[PDB]
């Protein structure tokens, strides 16, 4: 078939950490892990390449760097083989830079299952990360797998390679999942402190709901709005439940 | 070790400055970044809130566009649109034989600057603005530098045309900077070289570019008329002819002292 | 910073132990002998020069006899002249500690003016002056009312030794815990 | 909530086209058709107002108190200005003239309307400034305990398309909101001495600023609690729309004599 890309908590985060700091005017780099294909591909980990003054092309994969990093990872259990390469780039829906494809193509003579993934930090500051993964097409795989497909059949006998979008998924263990949600001790002890200081500030918070209500009643008059008032009523109920709980 | 420090500095990034237009709330500000447009920004880590005020320069993030730290505001010393020469480069006693002009200039400038106290006791204000008129080529220029030398005043030489930028408010900004810095660096001489370009009369009553001249000129009249008063900042206007000074200036209270070169 | 690294000399440890013994009678701020039972005065530093005085001091502090003060060390060296200012300061120290453990198992800042006088063994004006100095010295605050006869100053000072600190802690623990458990139980149920 | 949060661009709402859809001009030069919130669509929706815009979202984040700024230097507000009846005595005619024109509608709009005479909405002052005239203007503002908004009228004169129209709009709005108020136009003769005879060309940029000032000036001040006072170095003629009744109705002279 074709790939579905499971990115690990530490892999996703490393992709964002490196990409942001390496800015457009790019840094480049390698993805590590492995899979057994046809429905399971895992990206365990990632590391950064060290900025080179020829933008983010095949010339920017420092082979001594990668070799030394792979060996040192190995001695701490974390080394695996390249499952693709990632980076940071201007962001495109047809491929993030020209350089990433031209790098990808050299890789593609060796591999036959290597992806290019890039996250673009320009569009990842609307509070929703914009991240893409694309790979080029291969013959004898993406026609053997997914009238039949006339379109994709003339496309593959034609170009031989062209961009296609790969899915974004995540995989993480239960151990991570449990022990995030006791951080996000600070939360429990912080919760006591917050209750105490809230009762202190209540003098002002009192007065504004008094105002909110005066607007509210006036509004309903003018109409004769209703929706706001109901939302406006619900909110006030929630706040009192909280005020009572404090004390 | 030092070359290795240059790569470390290259990963120790700078960030752009803008100036606060006005504070809406402690969660909403209008800041004008220096890259041009206006933005609504909030705050981020590493600030003081007691160095915040309207009209101070702030530091904003490249990728978050929020107030990361608060800066002092800075004049910027320049040599382009205000060339500043602390003291003058020629002596006042050494140019004697230009005696008459020297004495008039001492008595308007030196005595209030050293001693506000005497003008204050009488209850008539210290002098405003002085005009030197008659030839610039007889050694007018020498006199202006020379007065600055004895007071130890900050000499502020202005190119009047350079006060003529063709952008929104750069021209407001220069008058404002020039005055603010005069107050800090007071005593000061603000010397305006050939006033016809920031203080015309109009070409023929018509306009081509003679509205830029009016935009400039209203700003000088405003500072004067204002609540801010001239007495430890002195402004001296120079022009060959008084026949392309504006009537506003010729009226007492924007110039009151008029020294002629005899 | 002398003892745990050795390098010591019999001459040096003679000065330090005797010098400590004279200084400990001669002035204080914390308490006059409880700290010298968690405070080596002769625990194999050296035993020479009549370290009996330390034990004599605790008996003297409790009785508060003048005869005992001369017979604590020897006449002249008991007096100093140090002890002439010292006896009032030293005096308040014994009273403060003895009451602090005893009066209420919780530790509350309520004292009778009367029972501070009775325990310290001094006349009514005198205690008035001594307390007056004592609030100045701190480790207190919260504001004693010199009419209402309420010594109502806050609880905040250190508590002496590992002995009746531990007895007192057990009582207090069972109570702190019990209080918490009630609140918890009620919440749990509904 | 979090999606629509700082950082933000500033825009202005021009008009609502239909339901849940509005046109904004952002200040950069890019104009967007955007959505408004459904809870901002009713009972908080003004036909022109200042807005907070997101730079990816293209949606109405927030509605702003109108005071959005310009690349020209900001105008001056002076609550209780410090010139307050300095020069007096022998200005007898000019003090009386100011007093009935400028002070009375600010304290009471309502008496003018009840008589049914038009209140002065705008006044034009001619004769020198900074020699007895300014002093009075400032003093009236302080005595009526209105905000003095000193508005730099030779400072439209920006050299770009319209920053300048956006700023006048913000200022008239904000004056009616912060009533009682004086908008004091320093040298109005800068942005309104043009074409009387096909002389004083080069004044194409101020023509937009002029239209914007007239629509704001005549369209408010119907009862008058906000005064406009026009100021000219001596006298200058103006383009015919200011001068006609309904605007600069009092034309006050400083005596030659």
């Amino acid at each position: 078939t074709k790939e579905t890309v499971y990115i690990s908590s530490i892999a996703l985060l490393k992709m964002l950490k490196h990409g942001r700091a390496g800015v457009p005017m790019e840094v480049m780099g390698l993805m590590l892990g492995e899979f057994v294909d046809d429905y399971t591909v895992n990206v365990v980990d990632v590391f950064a390449m060290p900025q080179s003054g020829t933008g983010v092309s095949v010339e920017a994969v420092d082979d001594v760097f990668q070799a030394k990093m792979m060996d040192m990872l190995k001695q701490t259990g974390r080394d695996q083989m390249v499952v693709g390469w990632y980076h940071s780039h201007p962001g495109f829906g047809c491929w993030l830079s020209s350089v990433d494809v031209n790098t990808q193509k050299s890789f593609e003579q060796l591999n036959s299952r290597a992806v290019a993934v890039v996250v673009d930090p320009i569009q990842s500051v609307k509070g929703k990360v914009v991240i893409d993964a694309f790979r080029l097409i291969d013959t004898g795989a993406l026609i053997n797998n997914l009238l039949n497909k006339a379109n994709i059949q003339a496309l593959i006998h034609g170009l031989n390679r062209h961009y296609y979008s790969l899915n974004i998924d995540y995989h993480k263990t239960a151990k991570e999942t449990k022990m995030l949600m006791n951080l996000h001790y600070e939360e429990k002890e912080e919760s006591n402190l917050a209750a105490t200081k809230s009762m202190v500030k209540i003098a002002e918070q009192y007065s504004k709901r008094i105002e909110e209500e005066k607007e509210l009643t006036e509004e309903e008059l003018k109409t004769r709005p209703k929706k706001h008032l109901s939302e406006t009523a619900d909110e006030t109920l929630e706040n009192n439940i909280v005020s009572v709980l404090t004390a | 070790d030092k070359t290795e420090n240059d790569i470390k500095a290259l990963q120790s990034i700078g960030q752009l400055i803008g100036e606060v237009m006005k504070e809406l709330s402690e969660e909403k500000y209008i800041v004008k970044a220096s890259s041009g447009p206006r933005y609504i920004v909030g705050v981020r880590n590493s600030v003081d809130r007691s160095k915040l005020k309207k009209g101070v320069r702030v530091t904003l993030d490249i990728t978050t566009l929020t107030i990361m730290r608060i800066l002092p505001r800075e004049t910027d010393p320049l040599v382009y649109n205000m060339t500043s020469f602390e003291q003058g480069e020629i002596t006042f006693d050494g140019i004697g034989g230009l005696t008459e002009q020297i004495r008039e200039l001492r008595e308007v400038i030196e005595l209030p600057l050293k001693n506000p106290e005497i003008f204050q006791r009488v209850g008539i204000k210290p002098p405003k603005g002085v005009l030197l008129y008659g030839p610039p080529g007889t050694g007018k220029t020498l006199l202006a530098k020379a007065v600055a030398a004895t007071i130890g005043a900050n000499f502020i030489f202005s190119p009047a045309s350079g006060i003529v930028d063709k952008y929104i408010g750069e021209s407001a900004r220069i008058i404002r900077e020039m005055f603010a810095y005069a107050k800090e660096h007071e005593p000061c001489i603000i010397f305006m070289d050939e006033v016809d370009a920031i203080g015309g009369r109009r070409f023929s009553e018509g306009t081509s570019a003679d509205r830029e001249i009016q935009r400039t000129l209203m700003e000088l009249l405003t500072q004067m008329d204002g609540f801010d008063n001239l007495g430890q900042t002195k402004i001296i206007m120079a022009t060959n002819r008084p026949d392309t000074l504006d009537p506003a200036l010729l009226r007492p209270g924007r110039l009151d002292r008029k020294v002629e070169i005899p | 910073t002398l003892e745990p690294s050795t390098s010591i000399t019999l001459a040096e440890r003679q000065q330090l132990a005797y010098d400590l013994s004279i200084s400990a009678l001669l002035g204080d701020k914390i308490y006059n002998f409880g700290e010298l039972l968690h405070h080596p005065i002769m625990e194999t530093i050296v035993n020479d020069s009549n370290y009996d005085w330390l034990f004599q001091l605790l008996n003297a502090l409790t009785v508060g006899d003048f005869d005992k003060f001369d017979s604590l060390i020897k006449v002249q060296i008991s007096k100093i002249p140090i002890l002439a200012q010292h006896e009032s300061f030293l005096r308040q120290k014994i009273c403060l500690m003895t009451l602090i453990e005893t009066v209420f198992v919780k530790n509350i800042r309520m004292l009778s003016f009367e029972d501070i006088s009775k325990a310290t063994h001094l006349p009514k004006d005198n205690v008035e002056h001594l307390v007056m100095r004592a609030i100045s010295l701190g480790l207190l605050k919260g504001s004693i009312d010199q009419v209402n006869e309420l010594v109502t100053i806050s609880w905040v000072q250190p508590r002496i030794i590992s002995g009746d600190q531990i007895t007192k802690m057990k009582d207090r623990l069972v109570e702190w815990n019990d209080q918490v458990e009630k609140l918890g139980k009620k919440m749990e149920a509904r | 909530k979090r999606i629509q949060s700082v950082p933000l661009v500033i825009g202005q709402f021009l008009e609502p086209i239909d339901q849940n859809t509005g046109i904004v001009s952002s200040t950069t030069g890019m104009s967007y058709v955007v959505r408004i919130l459904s809870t901002l669509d009713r009972e908080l929706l003004k036909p022109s107002m200042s807005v907070a815009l997101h730079r990816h979202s293209n949606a109405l984040v927030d509605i702003l108190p109108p005071d959005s700024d310009s690349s020209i230097s900001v105008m001056g507000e002076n609550e209780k200005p410090d010139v307050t009846y300095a020069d007096v005595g022998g200005l007898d005619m000019q003090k009386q003239e100011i007093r009935e024109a400028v002070e009375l509608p600010l304290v009471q709009a309502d008496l003018y309307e009840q008589i049914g005479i038009d209140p002065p909405r705008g006044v034009l002052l001619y004769g020198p400034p900074g020699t007895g005239k300014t002093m009075l203007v400032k003093a009236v503002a302080n005595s009526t305990k209105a905000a003095f908004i000193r508005v730099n009228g030779s400072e439209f004169v920006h050299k770009y398309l319209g920053e300048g129209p956006r700023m006048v709009r913000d200022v008239f709005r904000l004056a009616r909101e912060n009533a009682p108020s004086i908008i004091f136009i320093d040298e109005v003769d800068s942005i309104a001495t043009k074409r009387f005879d096909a002389q004083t060309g080069s004044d194409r940029e101020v023509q937009r600023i002029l239209i914007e000032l007239l629509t704001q000036m005549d369209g408010f001040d119907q009862s008058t609690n906000v005064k406009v006072i026009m100021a000219t170095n001596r006298a200058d003629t103006l383009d015919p729309a200011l001068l006609r009744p309904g605007r600069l109705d009092r034309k006050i002279e400083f005596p030659s004599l």
Partner: protein
């Protein structure tokens, strides 16, 4: 006292001057006053709808 410049009262019979103003009970009085006013408004509006 009678326009409340002075923080007290005359206790006549002792002939001494004593405080009555243990500061202002009524310091959130106005906020309550509005609150009543809103509630009345509401009750009237509901009644119309009802019938």
């Amino acid at each position: 006292i009678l326009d409340k410049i002075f923080y007290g009262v005359l206790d006549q019979g002792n002939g001494w001057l004593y405080v009555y103003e243990t500061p202002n009970q009524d310091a959130t009085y106005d906020s309550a006053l509005e609150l009543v006013g809103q509630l009345n408004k509401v009750v009237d509006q509901l009644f119309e709808k009802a019938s």
